[PDB]
Amino acid sequence: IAKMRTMIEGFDDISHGGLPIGRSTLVSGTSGTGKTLFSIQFLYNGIIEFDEPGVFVTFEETPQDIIKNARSFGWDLAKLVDEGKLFILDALSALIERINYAIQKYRARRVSIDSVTSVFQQYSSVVRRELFRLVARLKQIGATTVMTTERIEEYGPIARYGVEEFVSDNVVILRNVLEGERRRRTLEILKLRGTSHMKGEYPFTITDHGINIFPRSSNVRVSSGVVRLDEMCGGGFFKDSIILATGATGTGKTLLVSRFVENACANKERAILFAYEESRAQLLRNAYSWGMDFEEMERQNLLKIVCAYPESAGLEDHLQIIKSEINDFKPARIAIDSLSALARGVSNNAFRQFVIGVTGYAKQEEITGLFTNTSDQFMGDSHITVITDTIILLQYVEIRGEMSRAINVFKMRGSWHDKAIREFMISDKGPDIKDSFRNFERIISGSPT
Amino acid sequence: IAKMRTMIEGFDDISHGGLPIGRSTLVSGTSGTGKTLFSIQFLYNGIIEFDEPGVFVTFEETPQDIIKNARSFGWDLAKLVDEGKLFILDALSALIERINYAIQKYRARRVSIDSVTSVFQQYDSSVVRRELFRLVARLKQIGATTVMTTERIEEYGPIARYGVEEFVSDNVVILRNVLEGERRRRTLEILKLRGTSHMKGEYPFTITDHGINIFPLRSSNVRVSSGVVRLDEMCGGGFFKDSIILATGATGTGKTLLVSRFVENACANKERAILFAYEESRAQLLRNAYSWGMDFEEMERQNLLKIVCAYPESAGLEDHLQIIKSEINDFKPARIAIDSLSALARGVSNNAFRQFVIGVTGYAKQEEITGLFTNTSDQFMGITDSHITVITDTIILLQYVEIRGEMSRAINVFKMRGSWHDKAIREFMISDKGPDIKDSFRNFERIISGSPT
Amino acid sequence: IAKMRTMIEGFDDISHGGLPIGRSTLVSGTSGTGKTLFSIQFLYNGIIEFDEPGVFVTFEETPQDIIKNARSFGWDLAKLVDEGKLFILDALSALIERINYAIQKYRARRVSIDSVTSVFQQYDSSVVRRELFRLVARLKQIGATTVMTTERIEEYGPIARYGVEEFVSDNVVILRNVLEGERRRRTLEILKLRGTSHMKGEYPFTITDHGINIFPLRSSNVRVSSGVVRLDEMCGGGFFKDSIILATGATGTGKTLLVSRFVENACANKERAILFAYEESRAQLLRNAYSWGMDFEEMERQNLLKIVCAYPESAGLEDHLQIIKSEINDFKPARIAIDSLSALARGVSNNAFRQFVIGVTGYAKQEEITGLFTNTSDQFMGITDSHITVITDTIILLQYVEIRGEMSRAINVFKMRGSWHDKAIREFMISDKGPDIKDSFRNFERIISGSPT
Ligand SMILES: Nc1ncnc2c1ncn2[C@@H]1O[C@H](COP(=O)(O)OP(=O)(O)OP(=O)(O)O)[C@@H](O)[C@H]1O
Ligand SMILES: Nc1ncnc2c1ncn2[C@@H]1O[C@H](COP(=O)(O)OP(=O)(O)OP(=O)(O)O)[C@@H](O)[C@H]1O
Ligand SMILES: Nc1ncnc2c1ncn2[C@@H]1O[C@H](COP(=O)(O)OP(=O)(O)OP(=O)(O)O)[C@@H](O)[C@H]1O
Ligand SMILES: Nc1ncnc2c1ncn2[C@@H]1O[C@H](COP(=O)(O)OP(=O)(O)OP(=O)(O)O)[C@@H](O)[C@H]1O
Ligand SMILES: Nc1ncnc2c1ncn2[C@@H]1O[C@H](COP(=O)(O)OP(=O)(O)OP(=O)(O)O)[C@@H](O)[C@H]1O
Ligand SMILES: Nc1ncnc2c1ncn2[C@@H]1O[C@H](COP(=O)(O)OP(=O)(O)OP(=O)(O)O)[C@@H](O)[C@H]1O
Ligand SMILES: Nc1ncnc2c1ncn2[C@@H]1O[C@H](COP(=O)(O)OP(=O)(O)OP(=O)(O)O)[C@@H](O)[C@H]1O
Ligand SMILES: [Mg+2]
């Protein structure tokens, strides 16, 4: 079976090409999931890319409202209708023949129906029979159609009468689950008759572009901002690598992030600092307190600061922003301060995927990523440390009633690193890595000898 | 699609502007969620700000009742027929035609219908859909932004009664009132906005004398004194003006003491302060304050200190936030303290507590108010599981230390964001004057968990 | 009761032979479970192996579609009317009579009906039962082993749609497709087999180009080298050929290094090997390998090493197993490594992970393939909760050791099943050549948890 591209970012990979040609596809989901958006975007892209005439069978929504709503993404459906490319059919064997003629009147390939469930009020026994009749008249014609149906529950019947999925050849379930009052959009392909696909749900978002489903290794080294740090890292971090600075609160993660972001702008290199714990106002003072003019770096258009709240948006939304902001600014290195923030009030599963997407994309675009993590045992994991290539752990050490702090390169993939827990201290200039605690024994968890 | 501002505190941000123009919005919820309230505000603010004519369609409730009910907030019905700003239609093509006539009669587009499910008792979903769809078609044809009100049965069940009303509507706003732990929590959510964008997921709101109060989601180097001199010296000069300080420790360490001195220092410099107590009562606070050499009555007599003690399980976290909001907005203090956060987290979801901290933290820094929140650590004589220490800019840790069968206590500035601080665990003592920070324990080591050597 | 083989990989074991002769079997499941697939295989294998005539009864799906759909696996419809092996009947005593005629017309007993619930839209359970019972009575009277296909609504709800179809049928096979953690898992179960025995409970299966692939549930003293000489010496000569080795430790200890040397040693002796990566990517693997003095490209150039990296949350555990199965069956390696097991357990049920380990372990020993699985221990600088250490024959434990403010690491052969091994915790170091095992820590003691003395 041949598949038709939908040009929906992610769907082509999940569907292994796209939607089956000749056959119809069902798109079930609750209200506000994006059944119509998919429906329109399926057509829009069909005529904008492959020049294939498509027809939209409306029902409870009018042709004008469709265009008006579609103009949110900058899609001039009117111009497409003005060229006779997209035919909006206003609105059960009458419509069947009314839709059959239209397809031929334009010499069609793709068709969208939003929604069949709208034309089944009067009429589960009859639904199937009439539903099966429609699918048959489309397959016979040979036009790839996307059918929209509506669901009551996110984890319940596939359609409304629990029959539309069985009559349909392909089933795509759009979800919108509310876990901890957050709301997360996920799309899934339940089945594809006569072809393979990716199973299970996948995080997606809706932006001014539409649906956005998210399904070398150079030996070049870069600097972290700290000379000794580069020295104990065996010459510095790798360009296409993910570094992680984990420690207790007030150890100096944000300090290292600042110097790491600074060092970029010290060599005409663009950088992004994704704040999640502090605001720009506060970050500016702290930076200047450490002898770094962040305001200047924003004036050189080398540093970009994006601050936001981890509980404000979803993880799938946080990822899109990162991507968009990365795609626009095109930084040399990014930093997320911090991951532990993007984790609170989130399913461990949904967080892992987030970490994979960011790291995966950070290395796909060859960007040095410095993510920080706050340890939950201050002066005292979730297995995201196996994604990071380098690990810089900061830990305090109670010494003679004086609360000090130490630094150590826990690991360094494909490179030598210093295996010593050096003590360091923070001043108005920045960090200063001194010697290691040769006397203090067993300082891995504190209480040194 | 343009948006019309509803002037409902918080909603204008969650909707990214407001409600779409010439479009029908649904507002489903259980009984007592605040559908009518929202419905009224939409109109009230319409003609009471933008002079935008608007008509309210009643059904189960009488005009007189509505007018009387809305007097709880202070909204008079002198804009009804005593100005021609409102249009209460007492109560399917008959009503529509009347509504269509009233619109142009008053020359308006702001409409509020409450309730719609009540006018479907003559039937029992197909008929609802058909009739419901015709209504939105009519209204959209006139081009009047209408707010429709539907009722639900479950907080986490069907959007509307017949599981269809949301599919016909262009906009869906779900008002909730979840009961978790014998405590109610009002949350509003925008499910979808056809043709535009919005914030996703639920947002905590409250109903007060103002009405609905939704809760959506610089940097000076000026230093302020904490009350204690030595503490200011170990903080490298003192706390920051627009900063949040946290004093954690076991029970009976001295958090309430530090708070007293912190608030005292305000009133001493002729600056207003608020003390939000949650563990002790004013009666007891005055008694302990004076025991340390602080006249809280004197401070209350100068109108520089306000005490607001209450039980952390008597109201929801959103209700506590609103109280803090109003008390701050009214008194306009230089610095506020919460004693304690831990007392507000008990019998609360970690999700709801985080949002509360963010809101209070955010608002404290937005008004440039020095904040001192306290928290009682679980381990008494022997971590901070909750991840609220990354929000606090300063952390003052108090810890007990057993020394030769003598229960002593130690203080330390754990961290100071964007400032040098002392890195020593000094021993401190409490007397009839206040805290006396002394020297650190250079002999006995490893007092992170207590019991050094 | 005799059984007829279905030639479906795994099913013949779970059914203790196959499907009962002259008896009606039910196959209920939700949409996309693989009912039609199973239905087709039953016939396809019938005439494509045992030359046993068989007729397929369609209903909602057209013959042309079925033929086209089954071309995803490579099954042609040249056995239909171009040989007379198949008999697709396009579509209650009328059909039965036709089915009865076709049977003797083709002289067969292999029948597949998909779907039956679709021919009950004219009604809405009593009628279903009565009509359904008459069908099994007819078919049993002809003595033709039929496979009936029904649809369900819930994975853990009624067996069939009307909660009756299972009671009329003699055999019940429930195809499931559970969604746990946004990941789908196909499981087939034989509920009952009237008159015979079978395996109880669900069994993981997958659908591939071959079709359905169900997963049901010697000893040489030949030694192989691990890559490292000293390691072979502490293993009493080296690992066993048909054995499973596990290398546990914190992150950045040297598990991936050992794997590289283990796989290197294979290709060095002109033996094929597969490296199933799950934590790093090929790009990065090549970079780190060469840093240790190993040319993985060279090994790939010799066609002795195959790298198969993928994300452990991109597919189900059963899907990962099938991939390992095919990759092994194709390449036919001397030794395979999985880096790592721990990465495959995250976001997975302990039940599903055990079965995965068993299958991979079992298949590795069944083909006499030396296996090296790695696992990252939770405690970093500071047990193995999962009970997968009793399956591994060898255990190579790597542990960090803090020595005078210097993060060193130690290696030890924790155990060696049916072989002498070294019982010393030797310190080891990583350089630009590989692992250098040295002497043990006779001074510093109690490095089980780390931080000796
Ligand atoms: N070549 C293939 N590779 C992988 N998976 C495939 C392939 N061909 C089919 N499939 C899988 O088989 C599924 C369809 O199987 P089948 O048609 O038997 O389902 P079903 O349960 O009978 O569906 P329905 O209840 O809708 O009739 C697809 O969703 C797909 O996941
Ligand atoms: N002045 C006030 N102060 C505090 N809360 C108030 C005040 N006036 C009204 N309320 C709250 O508003 C609620 C009623 O709001 P409203 O009448 O909009 O509810 P509703 O959801 O429309 O109810 P129903 O579904 O029964 O019509 C009361 O239960 C009360 O909690
Ligand atoms: N310009 C935009 N930017 C961002 N998000 C948008 C934008 N336009 C729409 N959206 C989002 O997408 C949704 C529109 O989806 P759509 O109208 O297709 O929903 P639907 O599932 O078809 O709803 P219904 O079942 O009620 O017809 C909006 O509610 C909003 O959440
Ligand atoms: N007049 C006094 N003289 C000496 N010590 C006093 C006096 N009044 C109080 N204290 C000391 O102060 C302690 C209580 O201080 P405070 O109430 O500030 O502590 P806390 O840690 O906030 O307590 P809780 O967690 O119970 O609210 C007493 O246990 C006692 O040791
Ligand atoms: N100007 C300064 N002079 C000296 N030390 C400073 C200065 N500014 C900050 N510090 C030190 O650095 C610490 C803050 O560093 P940073 O904010 O990077 O830590 P962090 O571990 O990222 O904290 P958090 O977990 O709260 O984000 C302060 O607690 C203090 O000890
Ligand atoms: N020889 C055997 N050895 C082992 N187990 C057997 C044997 N024969 C039958 N069984 C088991 O017992 C079951 C037979 O039970 P039985 O036919 O009484 O079920 P039932 O509850 O009456 O079913 P129904 O409700 O469909 O009539 C088989 O499905 C199988 O699990
Ligand atoms: N060229 C090199 N020279 C010296 N040491 C090196 C070199 N390359 C890597 N290392 C060491 O090897 C370690 C990583 O080894 P490896 O990746 O095998 O460990 P691992 O325990 O499998 O790690 P992970 O759990 O992160 O996958 C580094 O932390 C470093 O100490
Ligand atoms: Mg729609």
Ligand SMILES: [Mg+2]
């Ligand atoms: Mg920080």
Ligand SMILES: [Mg+2]
């Ligand atoms: Mg009301």
Ligand SMILES: [Mg+2]
């Ligand atoms: Mg107290």
Ligand SMILES: [Mg+2]
């Ligand atoms: Mg089928």
Ligand SMILES: [Mg+2]
């Ligand atoms: Mg490794």
